[PDB]
């Protein structure tokens, strides 16, 4: 199937990318026309 | 109370509550042992007082810094204010992480 | 009126699934007619 050490790495990468994207969104929202 | 006294009461309540007061009352622990070596859910009175202090001080550092941003403030005093806030927050975070590591080995 | 009469009929014979289905249909129809009528009423009021 899928070994754990793969699922954990996937979850870590996805979460870090998610939070960084959310932080970016805050920048984009502050600078509105 | 003007919505500030109530906030002070809530902060005091939060600190005390996160100190495991109900735990102490219901299950009486001795003041200082001999951090439980292997028991995650284990509360001595001193360790809990110290930790809840860390949590409350971190919140205080956030609000203390967040306030610093206000305009028309003298720079000599604002620099000191900013310093205090950064110190409090970083110390609270790193300390709490270290404490949890020491109490629960194998962390991460 | 048909919806309220159905509500009465449900009490004597129909169970809840059948009554709920019938109510779904009749309520959709009444909603369409009521939307049209209330739009007309709002125009006439102003």
């Amino acid at each position: 199937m899928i070994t754990d050490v793969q699922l954990a790495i996937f979850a870590n990468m996805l979460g870090v990318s998610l939070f960084l994207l959310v932080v970016l969104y805050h920048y984009v929202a502050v600078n509105n026309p | 109370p003007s919505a500030m006294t109530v906030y002070a009461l809530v902060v005091v309540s939060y600190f005390l509550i996160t100190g495991g007061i109900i735990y102490d009352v219901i299950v009486e622990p001795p003041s200082v042992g001999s951090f439980l070596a292997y028991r995650v859910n284990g509360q001595y009175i001193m360790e809990g007082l110290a930790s809840s202090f860390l949590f409350t001080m971190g919140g205080l550092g956030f609000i203390i810094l967040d306030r610093s941003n206000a305009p028309n403030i003298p720079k000599l005093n604002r620099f000191l204010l900013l310093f205090i806030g950064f110190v409090c927050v970083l110390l609270s975070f790193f300390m709490a992480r270290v404490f949890m590591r020491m109490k629960l080995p194998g962390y991460l | 009126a048909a919806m309220l009469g159905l509500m009465y009929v449900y009490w004597t014979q129909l169970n809840m699934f059948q009554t709920l289905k019938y109510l779904a249909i009749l309520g959709s129809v009444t909603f369409l007619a009521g939307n049209r009528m209330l739009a007309q009423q709002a125009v006439k009021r102003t």
């Binding site: - | - | 939307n35 209330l38 739009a39 709002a42």
Partner: protein, 76 residues
Amino acid sequence: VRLDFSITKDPAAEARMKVACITEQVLTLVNKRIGLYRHFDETVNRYKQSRDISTLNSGKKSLETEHKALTSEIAL
């Protein structure tokens, strides 16, 4: 996205909509006109222009400006 189902229609909120539609149209037209002018000036005036393709581009730009003026008068 085709069903309104609204009873009391607010024309004040519809005026903003019929302004947003127009300003999008005008922004598209103006950006396209600037791009067309720059592209014509860069592809027809390298070393020889003969004032024929440049004249056609000027006529097209005048027609585009006239259409934009009509749209601006309509939105005004």
